[PDB]
Design a protein around this ligand. Structure first.
Ligand SMILES: CCCCCCCCCCCCCCCCCC(=O)OC[C@H](CO[C@@H]1O[C@H](CO[C@H]2O[C@H](CO)[C@H](O)[C@H](O)[C@H]2O)[C@H](O)[C@H](O)[C@H]1O)OC(=O)CCCCCCCCCCCCCCCCC
Ligand SMILES: CCCCCCCCCCCCCCCCCC(=O)OC[C@H](CO[C@@H]1O[C@H](CO[C@H]2O[C@H](CO)[C@H](O)[C@H](O)[C@H]2O)[C@H](O)[C@H](O)[C@H]1O)OC(=O)CCCCCCCCCCCCCCCCC
Ligand code: CLA
Ligand code: CLA
Ligand code: CLA
Ligand code: CLA
Ligand code: CLA
Ligand code: CLA
Ligand SMILES: CC1=C(/C=C/C(C)=C/C=C/C(C)=C/C=C/C=C(C)/C=C/C=C(C)/C=C/C2=C(C)CCCC2(C)C)C(C)(C)CCC1
Ligand SMILES: CC1=C(/C=C/C(C)=C/C=C/C(C)=C/C=C/C=C(C)/C=C/C=C(C)/C=C/C2=C(C)CCCC2(C)C)C(C)(C)CCC1
Ligand SMILES: CCCCCCCCCCCCO[C@H]1O[C@H](CO)[C@@H](O[C@H]2O[C@H](CO)[C@@H](O)[C@H](O)[C@H]2O)[C@H](O)[C@H]1O
Ligand SMILES: [Fe+2]
Lengths: 66, 36, 328, 26, 333, 31, 37, 44, 416, 32, 53
C-alpha cells in the first residue's frame, strides 16, 4: 500500500509531464519536428531536403533559421 | 450444338440425382457407431 | 432376398475400403473436378487468344501461342459477356466460344462446384471414420477466398472479365488492378489476412521446432530420428515438459500452452479466421467498400498539403489505375 | 548468406552433440 | 561455483520471472533501444527533411501512416552515428537527417542476434536440440536482406523500407514497380513457403482437434489424438497422408523457414538490380507484333505506371519534373 | 520447342503425383 | 427532424442505438463477476 | 429432349426406381424415438 | 461441469432446457425490435428534409417509403410522423418482448414440458416439432398476406415504375399466373435474367407474395396435421442442433440472396430512397453525357450489340441489362430508340440521371446493406457447417472424440 | 527501490509509456 | 532464337538429380531399407524388422 500511494502521485506527475512536453512546444524543438506554421517559409516554397552529407548540420541551420 | 447440350444436361442430372438419392438412402445410419 | 442394385451401389459409394473415398459429395466432386482439370490443361496448352477487353484486342494465354508457364493463363471471359451464362452450346461456333473466354467460365464453375463438394466430402469421410467433423470448416476459408476471387468479385463488378485469371502473371495482374481500384493494402481485413498468414507460418515453424527440439532418443547415431516414431504407437514421441519449459523460459515464466488441445485449436483457428476475414474483405470490396483513405490528412497552417506515406501509396495506385483505365 | 545458415547449423550440432540423437523421456 | 565468472554465470541463468542469460546482456539493451527508438520516431520525429513527409503522431499521423523513415539519399550508406560527422552530437539534427532509422536498424540487428543467441542458450540450459534457433534464422535472413543487404546494394539507406505500416506498403509497390518482384522465382518460392506454412498450421491444428481421443493432462504419456485415424482420413481425402509424427513436425518447421530463406536470396539479387524483370523473347515478340499481348506484358505496363507516377514524390531528392505527356497512360497508348 | 518442354515438365509432374498417390508406401500399423 | 412535442427527447435518441450492443458486453461482465463458472 | 424437362424427369425416374427398389424392403414403417434412425435393412 | 460446456459456449446449456430457451429467444426478439425502433428514431432525428434519403445514411426510412408511408409523387418525403409512430410502436413492443423474455429466462417455468404439455416439447418428437413449424409457417403466411393487404387495400406501395417519375400506387391486378410467378423462382441466376432479383414491377411482387402466403398457409396446416414420412424420418437428424443447422443454412441462403437483391434490384429498392445501383449509375453517366452531346448540336456514345440492341458504348456496355424507370420511356422494341432520344425526353429524367452521376469517401446505403448482409450470410453458412457436423456427430455418438477401446479405423482392412 | 532485475526492467518500460501516453493525449488537442 | 544452353540447363538440371534420387532408392530397395514402416536398426548395418513381420 506504501507503493500505491507513491504511484498515485508519480503516475499523474509523469502523465502531466508528457502532456506539457507537447502542449508547450518543447517536443518540436527537441526533435526538430516543424510546427504547422513552419513547414514552408516565405523565402522557401519548396520541400527542404538535405543535399550534402557532411554539411547536413550547417545546411539545416541556415534553412530552419527564423 | 443441341446434342452436346442434351448430353451435358443428362450427365449433370444423373450425377445430381445420384447425390440426392444417395443422401436419402438412410445416410445417418452409415456410421461406425451404429446401434444394432 | 437378393440385394438390390441400389444397395450395392450405396455400399460401394460410401465404402471406407476404397483407395480414395468417393461418397455422395464425391459423386459431385469427381466429375466436376476432372472436367475442370482436363479443360484447364487443354486450354493452358492450346487455346486461341481471348478478347477479354471486348474491343477486338485479344490476350494470348496458351503455351502454343507464345507464352511460358509463368505468363500462361486461362484468360477470363470477355467483357461483352459480363455475368451472362456462356456454355459451349450457347455460342455460334467453337471458335467464337474460345474467342470470348468460354473455357474460363467452364473451368471456374466446375472448380467451384468441386471445391464445395470437397468440403462436403471431408465432412463425409470424417463421419464414416467416427471422428469430429470440423476439418471441413477449416477448409471453408480457402474455399471462401477462391469464391470471392472467382465468383463474387465478378458479381459485384458485373463481369467475369474482372475475375482472377487462371495463371501466375494473371494473378499478379489481378492483384495490381485490385490494389489500384480498391486499395486492398489499407483494408483492415487484408491486414487481418496478412496477420493470419504470417502468424500461421510463425506458429507452424514454432510448433514444429518445439516438437523437433524435444524428440525422445530412440535411434542410433546419425540414423534418421524419424525411425524413432512407430506408426500407431501409443506413447508420446517427444518430451512435452522440456519443450514447455523452453517456451516458458523463452518469453516469460508461464507462457507455454500447457494444454495441447487449446494449442492445436489456436493453430487451427488463427489462419482460418484470418483467411475468412481477407476473403470477406475481397468480397466486400467488390461492392465498392474500399479500404482506409488517409489521403491529404496532414495540412499546414496555410492549407498546403504535407504528404504522408499514404500519399506515396496513393501515387502508386494512381499510376496503376491510369495505366489500367484504357480510354475511360 | 547461405553460409551464415551453415554456421548456425554446425554450431548447434557442436554444442548439442550429446543430445542430437534425441533427449531423455523424463 | 569456483570463480567470479561462475557466480555471474549462476546469477544470469537463475530461474527468475524472466530469463536473462549471457545473451541477455546483448539482447535486452539492444531490443529495448530498437523498440523504444521506433516508438519515439513514430510519436515525435518527422521525415520532412529527408522525404518531404509528415510521419509522426505530433504532425497528425495515425498508427497506420506514422513511420521511422529512412535517412536522406545524400547520407549514402553512412552509419549516421550521433557523434558522427553528419550530426556532430546534435540530437535534433540527428533526428532530422534520419539518424533514428540507422539507430533502430542497427540496434534491431544486434537485437535479433541476441534473441537467436538466447534461443541457443535456453536450449542448452533446458537440454533440448536447438531447432528453434534454426527456425528463427528465417526471420533473421529476411530482416538482414531486406533492411540491410538491399539498401547496401542500392544507392543509399533511403531505398530501404521505413519502419511503418503504410511505409512498408509503399515498399511492396516500389519493388513491384521497379524490380517486378512478383515475377521473381525466389519470391514465388517464398510465397509457397509462407502460404504453405499457414496451410500446415491450419490443417494440423484441425486434424489434431478432430481426431482427438475421448478422454490434456500435462504429464500424459499417451498421445491425445489418433494418428492412425488421421492418416486414414487424409489418405482417402487427399491421396497422401502423414504417418510419421516426427517427419510431420520437421515439415512444419521446414516449409515456412525455407520460404524465408528462398525469398531472401532473391532480395540479395534485387540489391544489385539483378531482377527478373522481363522475358526477353516475349518482349521482342511484342515489339515486332503490336497485336501480341499476354498477362506478363500487361504487368510490365503497370510497372511503368507505378515507376513514373511515384518517382516525383517517392524520390524527392532528385527533381524528376515529369510533364503530363511523358507520364504513361493506358488512354494515350 | 519451348512449349514442348513446358508440356513435358507439367505432364511429368502429374505422373510423379499419380505414382506418389497410387504407388505409395503402404502404411503398416506397428504391432 | 424529430416532431415538435418530442424535440426535448433529442439527446436520449443518439444513445438509443448503442443499447443492443452493450447487452453483449453485459453478458461478459456478468460471467466475469461470477468468475466464469 | 425438345423442352429439356424430359431429360430432367427421365433421369430422376431411372435412379428413382432404383432407390424405390431399395426402399421397398426397408422396415421403416414403425416410428422411432431417437436422434437418428439406425435401422437399415441390408439384404446382402 | 454439469453439462460439460464452458462459459464461452454457455448458451449450449439451454438445449434441453425449453423454458430458458424460450426466454432467451424472446429476449433476442425484443433486442431485434429494439434495434428496429431505435434505428428509425435515430434516422428521423437526423433526417434533413432537403437531402435525399440515400445521402444521409438511412437504411430503415427507405424501407418505410417503399411501403408508401409519408412519401409523395416522384419520391419526395413529405411527413416524418409515420416513421415516428413505427419507431414508437417498435419501442413499446420491444419493451413488452424484453419483459417476457426476461421473465421466461429467469423466473418462468424452467423445463416447461411437464407444466404445459402444449408448449413443452422434445427434440426427437417429430410430431411436436412439425406442429411448431406449421404454426410459425401459418404466421409467416399471415405476414405475407399483411404485405398484400398493404399493397392492394391499405394505402398502397410506392411504384417506382409509375409514369412521370414514380408514385405510391395501389395495385389492383396482381400477377396470379403461377407460370410467371414460379418461372421467376426457376429462372437462371446469371446475367440477363437474374433469378428472383430480376423482378421489375409491383404486380409480380404482390402476386408472388400472394402465392407465398397461400403456400405458407397450406404448408403450415400440412405440417401441423401430419407427420414426417419414412424417407424424411430416415434422412434427417432429430435434435435441436440439427434444426438450428438447417435454419442456419436457409438463413445463409436468404442473406446472400438479399445482398444481391439490394445490390441489383431497383424495384423493391427504388433508386429514389436507396440510391442508384452500380450499373444504374454507370448508365446514368453515359446517358447524361449523351444528353449533353445531343444538346450541343453512329455516335460514339452508343454502340450496336450483336443482338441488334442499341446500347451505350465504352466500359458501360457490360451493364446493358440495366433497366431503370427513366430509361424505359426512351427504350422501345430494339432498345434505345434513336428517335425517342431527342424527341420526347422529359426534364424529370434529365435531373435524375445527373443526380445519379455524382453517386457513382461516399458509401451508398446499397453498398452498406450488400456488404453487411453478405458478411452475415457467409458466416451463417460457416455456422451451418459447424452445427450440422456437430449435430450429426453428436447423434451418432462420437462428438466427444474417438473411443480408445474401439477405434473404428483399427477394425478396417488396410487401404493398400 | 533496487531489486536485482525487476524494478529496473519494469520501470524502463512503465516510465516512458506513461510519459508517451501523456504526450499522445496532448496531440489530440492540437488543431491543424 | 532458341537458347541452346537453356535447354541443357532444364534437361540436365532435371535429369541429374532425378537420376541420383532413383539410384539411391533402387539400392535402398536391395538392402531392404526403402520403407519407413520398419523398426530402427538393431545393430550397425542391420536394418530393423518391418512392422508387418
Ligand atoms: C548475418 C548475421 C549478421 C547480422 C548483421 C549484424 C549487424 C552488422 C552491422 C554491420 C553493417 C555494416 C554496414 C556498413 C555500411 C556500408 O557498408 O557502407 C558502405 C560503404 C561504402 O560506402 C559507399 O561507397 C560508395 C562507393 O563510393 C566510392 O566510389 C564513389 C564513385 O562514385 C566515390 O568515389 C566515393 O568517394 C568512393 O568511396 C558510395 O560512395 C556510397 O555513397 C557510400 O555509401 O562501405 C563500408 O562502409 C564498408 C564496406 C566494406 C565492408 C563490406 C561488408 C559489409 C557490407 C556487406 C554487404 C555488402 C554487399 C553489398 C551488396 C549488397
Ligand atoms: C443459385 C446458384 C448460385 C450461383 C450463382 C452465381 C452467379 C450469380 C450471378 O451472376 O449473380 C448476379 C445475379 C443477379 O442477377 C442480376 O440480375 C439483374 C436483374 O436486374 C434487372 O432487374 C432489376 C429490376 O429492378 C433492375 O431493373 C436492373 O436494372 C435489371 O437489369 C440483371 O439481370 C443482371 O444482369 C444479373 O446479373 O444473382 C443471382 O441471380 C442470385 C445470386 C445468388 C446469391 C449469390 C450466390 C451465392 C454466392 C455464391 C456462393 C458463394 C459462397 C461462398 C462460400 C463458398
Ligand atoms: C442463430 C445463430 C446461432 C445460434 C442460435 C447458435 C447457437 C449455439 N452455438 Mg453456433 N454459430 C453461429 C450461429 C449460431 N449459433 C454462426 C453464424 C457461427 C460461425 C461463426 C457459429 C459457430 C459456433 C461455434 C464455433 C460454436 C458455436 C456454439 C453454439 C452454442 C453456444 C453459443 C454461445 O454460448 O455463445 C457465446 C458467444 C460469444 C462467446 C460471443 C463471442 C464474440 C462474438 C464473436 C462477437 C461478434 C462481433 C459482433 C458482431 C460485434 C461485437 C463488437 C464488440 C462489441 C466486441 C449454441 C448452442 C459453441 C458450442 O460449443 O457448440 C454447440 C461453439 O463452440 N457456434
Ligand atoms: C442474446 C443474448 C443472450 C440471452 C438472451 C441469453 C440467455 C440466457 N443465458 Mg446466455 N450468453 C450470452 C448471450 C445470451 N444468453 C453470451 C454472449 C455469453 C458469453 C459470455 C453467454 C454465456 C452464458 C452462460 C455461461 C450461461 C448463460 C445462461 C443463460 C440463461 C440464464 C441466464 C441467467 O441465469 O441470468 C442471470 C443474470 C443475472 C442475475 C444478472 C442479469 C439480470 C438481467 C437479466 C439483466 C438485464 C435486465 C434487463 C435490462 C431488464 C429489462 C426489463 C424491462 C424491459 C421491463 C438465459 C436463458 C446460463 C445457462 O445456460 O442456463 C442456466 C449459463 O450458465 N449464458
Ligand atoms: C447490418 C445492419 C446495418 C447496416 C447495413 C447499417 C448501415 C448504416 N448505418 Mg447503422 N447500425 C446497425 C446496423 C446497420 N447499419 C447496428 C446493429 C447498430 C448499433 C451499433 C447501428 C448503429 C448506427 C448509428 C448510430 C449510425 C449508423 C449509421 C449507418 C450508415 C453509416 C455506417 C458507418 O458509419 O460505417 C461505420 C463502419 C464500421 C463501424 C465498420 C465496422 C463494422 C464491424 C467490423 C467487425 C467485423 C465483424 C463484425 C467481426 C465479427 C466476428 C466474426 C467471428 C463473425 C450506414 C447506412 C450512421 C448514419 O449514417 O445513419 C443515421 C449512424 O449515425 N448505424
Ligand atoms: C413465443 C411467445 C411465447 C410462448 C409460446 C410463451 C409460453 C408460455 N407463456 Mg410466455 N411471454 C411471452 C412469450 C411467450 N410465452 C411474451 C411476449 C410475454 C409478455 C406479455 C410473456 C409473459 C408471460 C407471463 C407473465 C406468463 C407467461 C406464461 C406462458 C405459458 C402459458 C401461456 C398459456 O397458457 O397460453 C394458452 C394457449 C393455449 C392453451 C406458456 C408456457 C405463464 C407462465 O409462464 O406460467 C405460469 C404466465 O404466467 N408468459
Ligand atoms: C419453412 C419451410 C419448410 C420446412 C422447414 C418444412 C419441413 C419439412 N417438410 Mg414441408 N412444406 C412447406 C415448407 C416447409 N416444410 C410449404 C410452404 C409446403 C406447401 C407446398 C410444404 C409441403 C410439404 C410436403 C408435401 C412434404 C413436406 C415435407 C417436409 C420435410 C422434408 C423436407 C425436405 O426434405 O425437402 C420437412 C420436415 C415432407 C414430409 O415428409 O411431410 C411432412 C413432404 O412430403 N412439406
Ligand atoms: C446485426 C444484425 C442485423 C441487423 C441490424 C439487420 C438489419 C436489416 N436487415 Mg438483416 N439479417 C441478419 C442480421 C441483421 N440484419 C443475419 C445474420 C441474416 C441472415 C444472414 C439476416 C437476413 C436478412 C435478409 C434476408 C434481409 C435482411 C434485411 C435487413 C433490413 C430490413 C430488416 C427487415 O425489414 O426485417 C423485417 C422482418 C420481419 C420478420 C419483421 C416482420 C415483418 C412483417 C412486416 C409487415 C408490414 C406490413 C406491410 C404492415 C401492413 C399494415 C397494414 C396492412 C395496415 C435491415 C437493415 C432485408 C433487406 O432489406 O435486404 C438486405 C432483407 O431482405 N436481413
Ligand atoms: C436473460 C438474460 C439476458 C437477456 C435479457 C435481454 C436481452 C433483455 C432485453 C431487454 C429489452 C429488449 C428491453 C426493452 C426495453 C425497452 C424500453 C424500456 C422502452 C422504453 C421506451 C421509452 C422510454 C420510449 C420513450 C420515448 C418515446 C415514447 C417517444 C420518443 C422519445 C422516447 C424514445 C424517450 C442477458 C443477456 C442480458 C443477461 C443474461 C440473462
Ligand atoms: C414473394 C415473391 C416471389 C416469390 C414467390 C415464390 C413462388 C417463392 C417460392 C419459393 C420456393 C418454392 C422455394 C423453394 C425452395 C426449395 C429449396 C430451398 C430446397 C432445398 C432442398 C433441400 C434443403 C434438400 C436437401 C437434401 C437433398 C438434396 C438430398 C437429401 C438430403 C437433403 C434432404 C438435406 C416472386 C419471386 C415471384 C416475386 C416477388 C415476390
Ligand atoms: C556483448 C554482450 C555479451 C553477449 C555474449 C552472448 C553469448 C551467448 C552464448 C549463449 C549461446 C551458446 O550456448 C551456450 O549455452 C550454455 C549457457 O547457458 C553453455 O553452458 C552449458 O555447458 C554445458 C553443456 O554441455 C551444460 O552442462 C551447462 O548446463 C550449460 O550451462 C554452453 O557451453 C553454450 O553452448
Ligand atoms: Fe502436434
Amino acid at each position: 500500500i506504501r507503493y500505491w500511494i507513491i504511484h498515485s502521485i508519480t503516475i499523474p506527475s509523469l502523465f502531466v509531464a508528457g502532456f506539457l512536453f507537447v502542449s508547450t512546444g518543447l517536443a518540436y524543438d527537441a526533435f526538430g519536428t516543424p510546427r504547422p506554421n513552419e513547414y514552408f517559409t516565405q523565402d522557401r516554397q519548396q520541400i527542404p531536403l538535405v543535399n550534402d552529407r557532411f554539411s547536413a548540420k550547417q545546411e539545416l541551420e541556415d534553412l530552419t533559421k527564423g | 450444338m443441341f446434342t452436346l447440350k442434351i448430353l451435358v444436361y443428362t450427365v449433370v442430372i444423373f450425377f445430381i440425382s445420384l447425390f440426392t438419392f444417395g443422401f436419402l438412402s438412410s445416410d445417418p445410419s452409415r456410421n461406425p457407431n451404429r446401434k444394432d | 432376398e437378393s440385394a438390390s442394385f441400389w444397395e450395392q451401389f450405396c455400399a460401394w459409394i460410401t465404402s471406407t475400403e476404397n483407395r480414395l473415398y468417393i461418397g455422395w459429395f464425391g459423386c459431385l466432386m469427381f466429375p466436376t473436378l476432372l472436367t475442370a482439370t482436363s479443360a484447364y490443361i487443354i486450354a493452358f496448352i492450346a487455346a486461341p487468344p481471348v478478347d477479354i477487353d471486348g474491343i477486338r484486342e485479344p490476350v494470348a494465354g496458351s503455351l502454343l501461342y507464345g507464352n511460358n508457364i509463368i505468363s500462361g493463363a486461362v484468360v477470363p471471359s470477355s467483357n461483352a459477356i459480363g455475368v451472362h451464362f456462356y456454355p459451349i452450346w450457347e455460342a455460334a461456333s467453337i471458335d467464337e466460344w474460345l474467342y470470348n473466354g468460354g473455357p474460363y467460365q467452364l473451368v471456374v464453375f466446375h472448380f467451384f462446384i468441386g471445391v464445395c463438394a470437397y468440403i462436403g466430402r471431408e465432412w463425409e469421410l470424417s463421419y464414416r471414420l467416427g471422428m469430429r467433423p470440423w476439418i471441413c470448416v477449416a477448409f471453408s476459408a480457402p474455399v471462401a477466398a477462391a469464391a470471392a476471387v472467382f465468383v463474387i468479385y465478378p458479381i459485384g463488378q458485373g463481369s467475369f472479365s474482372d475475375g482472377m485469371p487462371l495463371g501466375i502473371s494473371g494473378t499478379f495482374n489481378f492483384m495490381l488492378v485490385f490494389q489500384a481500384e480498391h486499395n486492398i493494402l489499407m483494408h483492415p481485413f487484408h491486414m487481418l489476412g496478412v496477420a493470419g498468414v504470417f502468424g500461421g507460418s510463425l506458429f507452424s515453424a514454432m510448433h514444429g521446432s518445439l516438437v523437433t527440439s524435444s524428440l525422445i532418443r530412440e535411434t542410433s547415431e546419425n540414423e534418421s530420428l524419424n525411425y524413432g516414431y512407430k506408426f500407431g504407437q501409443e506413447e508420446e514421441t517427444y518430451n512435452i515438459v522440456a519443450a514447455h519449459g523452453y517456451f516458458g523460459r523463452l518469453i516469460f515464466q508461464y507462457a507455454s500452452f500447457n494444454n495441447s488441445r487449446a494449442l492445436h485449436f489456436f493453430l487451427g483457428a488463427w489462419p482460418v479466421v484470418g483467411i475468412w476475414f481477407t476473403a470477406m474483405g475481397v468480397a466486400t470490396m467488390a461492392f465498392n467498400l474500399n479500404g482506409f483513405n488517409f489521403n491529404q490528412s496532414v495540412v499546414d497552417s496555410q492549407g498546403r498539403v504535407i504528404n504522408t506515406w499514404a500519399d506515396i501509396l496513393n501515387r502508386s495506385n494512381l499510376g496503376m489505375e491510369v495505366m489500367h483505365e484504357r480510354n475511360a | 548468406l547461405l553460409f551464415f545458415l551453415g554456421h548456425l547449423w554446425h554450431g548447434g550440432r557442436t554444442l548439442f552433440r550429446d543430445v542430437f540423437a534425441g533427449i531423455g523421456a523424463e | 561455483d569456483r570463480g567470479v565468472f561462475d557466480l555471474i554465470d549462476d546469477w544470469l541463468k537463475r530461474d527468475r520471472f524472466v530469463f536473462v542469460g549471457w545473451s541477455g546482456l546483448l539482447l535486452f539493451p539492444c531490443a529495448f533501444l530498437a523498440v523504444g527508438g521506433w516508438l519515439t520516431g513514430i510519436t515525435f520525429v518527422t521525415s520532412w527533411y529527408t522525404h518531404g513527409l509528415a510521419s509522426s503522431f505530433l504532425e497528425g499521423c495515425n498508427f497506420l501512416t506514422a513511420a521511422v523513415s529512412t535517412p536522406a539519399n545524400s547520407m549514402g550508406h553512412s552509419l549516421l552515428l550521433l557523434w558522427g560527422p553528419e550530426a556532430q552530437g546534435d540530437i535534433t539534427r540527428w533526428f532530422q537527417i534520419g539518424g533514428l532509422w540507422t539507430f533502430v536498424a542497427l540496434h534491431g540487428s544486434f537485437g535479433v542476434i541476441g534473441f537467436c543467441l538466447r534461443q541457443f542458450e535456453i536450449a542448452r540450459l533446458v537440454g533440448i536440440r536447438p531447432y528453434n534457433a534454426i527456425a528463427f534464422s528465417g526471420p533473421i535472413a529476411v530482416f538482414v536482406t531486406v533492411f540491410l543487404v538491399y539498401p547496401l546494394g542500392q544507392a543509399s539507406w533511403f531505398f530501404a523500407p521505413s519502419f511503418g505500416v503504410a511505409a512498408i506498403f509503399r515498399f511492396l509497390l516500389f519493388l513491384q514497380g521497379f524490380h517486378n518482384w512478383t515475377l521473381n522465382p525466389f519470391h514465388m518460392m517464398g510465397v509457397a513457403g509462407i502460404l504453405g506454412g499457414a496451410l500446415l498450421c491450419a490443417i494440423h491444428g484441425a486434424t489434431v482437434e478432430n481426431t482427438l481421443f475421448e478422454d490434456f493432462t500435462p504429464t500424459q504419456s499417451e498421445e491425445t489424438y489418433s494418428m492412425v485415424t488421421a492418416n486414414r482420413f487424409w489418405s482417402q481425402i487427399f491421396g497422401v497422408a502423414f504417418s510419421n509424427k516426427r517427419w510431420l513436425h520437421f515439415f512444419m518447421l521446414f516449409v515456412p523457414v525455407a520460404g524465408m530463406w528462398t525469398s531472401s536470396l532473391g532480395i540479395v539479387g534485387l540489391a544489385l538490380n539483378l531482377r527478373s524483370y522481363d522475358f526477353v523473347s516475349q518482349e521482342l515478340r511484342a515489339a515486332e507484333d503490336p497485336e501480341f499481348e499476354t498477362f506478363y506484358t500487361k504487368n510490365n505496363l503497370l510497372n511503368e505506371g507505378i515507376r513514373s507516377w511515384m518517382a516525383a514524390q517517392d524520390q524527392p531528392h532528385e527533381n524528376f519534373i515529369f510533364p503530363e505527356e511523358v507520364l504513361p497512360r493506358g488512354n494515350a497508348l | 520447342m519451348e512449349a514442348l518442354v513446358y508440356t513435358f515438365l507439367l505432364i511429368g509432374t502429374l505422373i510423379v503425383i499419380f505414382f506418389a498417390i497410387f504407388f505409395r508406401d503402404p502404411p503398416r500399423i506397428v504391432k | 427532424a424529430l416532431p415538435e412535442p418530442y424535440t426535448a427527447f433529442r439527446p436520449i435518441v443518439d444513445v438509443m442505438p448503442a443499447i443492443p450492443v452493450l447487452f453483449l458486453l453485459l453478458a461478459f461482465v456478468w460471467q466475469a463477476s461470477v468468475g466464469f463458472r | 429432349d425438345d423442352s429439356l424437362g424430359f431429360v430432367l424427369i427421365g433421369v430422376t425416374a431411372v435412379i428413382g426406381l432404383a432407390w424405390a427398389q431399395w426402399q421397398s424392403y426397408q422396415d421403416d414403417g414403425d416410428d422411432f424415438f431417437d436422434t437418428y434412425d439406425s435401422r437399415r435393412a441390408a439384404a446382402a | 461441469e454439469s453439462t460439460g460446456f464452458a462459459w464461452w459456449s454457455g448458451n449450449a446449456r439451454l438445449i434441453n432446457v425449453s423454458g430458458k430457451l424460450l426466454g432467451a429467444h424472446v429476449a433476442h426478439a425484443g433486442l431485434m425490435v429494439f434495434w428496429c425502433g431505435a434505428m428509425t428514431l435515430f434516422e428521423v432525428a437526423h433526417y434533413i428534409p432537403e437531402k435525399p434519403l440515400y445521402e444521409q445514411g438511412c437504411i430503415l426510412i427507405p424501407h418505410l417509403t417503399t411501403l408508401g408511408w409519408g412519401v409523395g409523387p416522384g419520391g419526395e418525403v413529405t411527413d416524418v410522423y409515420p416513421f415516428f409512430v413505427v419507431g414508437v410502436l417498435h419501442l413499446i413492443s420491444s419493451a413488452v418482448l424484453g419483459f417476457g423474455g426476461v421473465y421466461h429466462s429467469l423466473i418462468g417455468p424452467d423445463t416447461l414440458e411437464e407444466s404445459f404439455p402444449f408448449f413443452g416439447y422434445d427434440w426427437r418428437d417429430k410430431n411436436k416439432m412439425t406442429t411448431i413449424l406449421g404454426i410459425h409457417l401459418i404466421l409467416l403466411g399471415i405476414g405475407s398476406f399483411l404485405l398484400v393487404a398493404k399493397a392492394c387495400f391499405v394505402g398502397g406501395l410506392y411504384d417506382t415504375w409509375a409514369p412521370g417519375g414514380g408514385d405510391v400506387r395501389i395495385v389492383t391486378a396482381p400477377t396470379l399466373n403461377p407460370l410467371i410467378i414460379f418461372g421467376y423462382v426457376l429462372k437462371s441466376p446469371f446475367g440477363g435474367d437474374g433469378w428472383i432479383i430480376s423482378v421489375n414491377n409491383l404486380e409480380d411482387l404482390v402476386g408472388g407474395h400472394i402465392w407465398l402466403g397461400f403456400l405458407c398457409v397450406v404448408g403450415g396446416i400440412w405440417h401441423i396435421l401430419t407427420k414426417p414420412f419414412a424417407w424424411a424420418r430416415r434422412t434427417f437428424v432429430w435434435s435441436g442442433e440439427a434444426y438450428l443447422s438447417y435454419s442456419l443454412a436457409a438463413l445463409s441462403v436468404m442473406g446472400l440472396t438479399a445482398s444481391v437483391f439490394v445490390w441489383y434490384n431497383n424495384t423493391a429498392y427504388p433508386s429514389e430512397f436507396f440510391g442508384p445501383t452500380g450499373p444504374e449509375a454507370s448508365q446514368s453517366q453515359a446517358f447524361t453525357f449523351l444528353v449533353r452531346d445531343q444538346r450541343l448540336g453512329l455516335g460514339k456514345y452508343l454502340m450496336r450489340s450483336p443482338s441488334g440492341e442499341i446500347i451505350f458504348g465504352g466500359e458501360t456496355m457490360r451493364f446493358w441489362d440495366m433497366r431503370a424507370p427513366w430509361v424505359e420511356p426512351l427504350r422501345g422494341p430494339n432498345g434505345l430508340d434513336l428517335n425517342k432520344i431527342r424527341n420526347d425526353i422529359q426534364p424529370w429524367q434529365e435531373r435524375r440521371a445527373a443526380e445519379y452521376m455524382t453517386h457513382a469517401n461516399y458509401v451508398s446505403p446499397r453498398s452498406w446493406l450488400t456488404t453487411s448482409h453478405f458478411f452475415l450470410g457467409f458466416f451463417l453458412w460457416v455456422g451451418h457447417l459447424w452445427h450440422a457436423g456437430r449435430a450429426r456427430a453428436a447423434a451418432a455418438g462420437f462428438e466427444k472424440g474417438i473411443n480408445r477401446e474401439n477405434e473404428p479405423v483399427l477394425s478396417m482392412r488396410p487401404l493398400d | 527501490p533496487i531489486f536485482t532485475f525487476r524494478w529496473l526492467t519494469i520501470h524502463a518500460l512503465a516510465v516512458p509509456t506513461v510519459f508517451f501516453l501523456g504526450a499522445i493525449t496532448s496531440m489530440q488537442f492540437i488543431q491543424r | 532464337e532458341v537458347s541452346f544452353g537453356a535447354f541443357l540447363a532444364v534437361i540436365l538440371g532435371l535429369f541429374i538429380p532425378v537420376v541420383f534420387l532413383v539410384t539411391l532408392y533402387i539400392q535402398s530397395e536391395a538392402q531392404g531399407t526403402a520403407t519407413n514402416f520398419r523398426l530402427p536398426d538393431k545393430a550397425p548395418g542391420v536394418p530393423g524388422d518391418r512392422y508387418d513381420a
